[PDB]
Design a protein around this ligand. Sequence first.
Ligand SMILES: CC(=O)OCC[N+](C)(C)C
Ligand SMILES: CC(=O)OCC[N+](C)(C)C
Lengths: 275, 275
Amino acid sequence: ESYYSIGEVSKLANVSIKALRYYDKIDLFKPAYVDPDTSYRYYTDSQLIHLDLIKSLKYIGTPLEEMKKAQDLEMEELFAFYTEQERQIREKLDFLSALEQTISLVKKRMKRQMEYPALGEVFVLDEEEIRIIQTEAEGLGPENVLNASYSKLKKFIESADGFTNNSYGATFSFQPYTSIDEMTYRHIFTPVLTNKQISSITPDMEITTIPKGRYACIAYNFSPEHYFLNLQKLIKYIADRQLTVVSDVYELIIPIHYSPKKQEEYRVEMKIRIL
Amino acid sequence: ESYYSIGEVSKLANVSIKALRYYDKIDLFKPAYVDPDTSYRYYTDSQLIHLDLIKSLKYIGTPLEEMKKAQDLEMEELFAFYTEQERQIREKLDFLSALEQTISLVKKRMKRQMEYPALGEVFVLDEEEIRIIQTEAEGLGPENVLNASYSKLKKFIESADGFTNNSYGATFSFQPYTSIDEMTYRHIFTPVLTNKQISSITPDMEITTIPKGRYACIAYNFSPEHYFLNLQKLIKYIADRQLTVVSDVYELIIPIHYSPKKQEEYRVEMKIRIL
DNA sequence: GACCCTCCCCTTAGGGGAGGGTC
DNA sequence: GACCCTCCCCTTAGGGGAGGGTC
Ligand SMILES: CC(=O)OCC[N+](C)(C)C
Ligand SMILES: CC(=O)OCC[N+](C)(C)C
């Protein structure tokens, strides 16, 4: 007996003719006979048994050369191979569900931002804690901070989270500033999203957090005239209420879009904790 | 401002020069300036912000054209995109953990086989239940059964499990046969491995099982002289003990290897239930 | 007519060269 | 010397043709 044409076989095993032809090319699964005159491929019924494995292995996802060597193994030998495949699967799963969580949180963070009570206005609210990696900003003012200034931070973040946080942060001493050049950042930082142990972290990186507590905040969209005014707004709010400050000012800058085809726009949030 | 060479940027963002050049080719991320004389690529510090997304999206796994259109979205628009990515992740996870289970079981099944008390000898043992898909074998004897005879079964199996079961089964009426040609199969079947609802199953397929209970069994490696003798061995074992049979004889044939480079060998197991 | 053939271009996201300027 | 350039071949597992026999 009983001989199948490539088509017959295709229908039979549910494998594309192109597939079979290919698996012939790579000598993974060759027809039992090839008519020398017409180059036609013809297969034996007993032969189909091999596709059982080729197909299974394909479903798992093992690459073809891999199959080519796996098909040699005797049952004992193979069992092992299968346990290997298992661990690889669990690796993926671990990675994927990590990825599931981070996103959920990226969305949670991204949402609080799209639902902020109002812009250019100062609001006081109960905040949740936010872990971050920070580093001394060596006499670095909002005047000359660079993206390049964040690179090492972004490295450790990238390794741990895998997912470069949109957010850029810096903090400074809450003072009755009168102009931007009096301002200098104390540390700069990037919120961390993950609990994977950071690998091989250097000692110039403090892992620390923006504690939970009451924050006087303000959020707006960036425009230079506006930046210092909003600051002033905050200092005023606090001054009027007599409220007592207990942290630096936290500044967070997050893009609204990443289109290089449109004018770049950013969101800014200054937070500060009170009693 | 402050201008970076492709190298500077590479080091800075941890992205390969080849990557950047490519992302330039596809107009996903182009340098701010290209020296017309030396075709050198040069980038602005403010520009790096875009790789934040490109890199994140890459980690998730979204394809490049995809990114190209995602980078246009404003925050609201994007949030949605992220929820999309989420569901896709959960799809994968579901699939993967299904795959995790099936393998564990493929291994469990494969193991009982490598640890069978002895060959060509009849053993009586307490068996666990085994679900299967079967179908009337229309006057089909062990004499002329084909692999092609199993194709539809293998289809439904493939769809549900995704993983073509190694095992081939057939059953027949327990009789004091005297020769192979008196033997005809009643049904033929393939063990099922999964609980995914079988899709659109036809009515000529019975989903049914090999019940748990006590089985007189025998297992050996295929050789024609041996096949009928082993059968006879079984009939004798039962005859001597007077034991009372309550099912067909179940025959299972499973290859020991799938190498086309070696002589094909199979394992056979005849089981039968008693009281 | 329906089924098979070989050979060619096609996709992804670059890596690793070789061959040649340019900092 | 170290850094950048363009252009070319390379990988995976085939799918979708066009152009031509052959069942
Ligand atoms: C995003 C950007 O414009 O630069 C990052 C510095 N920061 C935090 C002052 C805004
Ligand atoms: C695997 C093989 O030789 O054919 C399948 C039929 N059966 C069950 C009689 C062996």
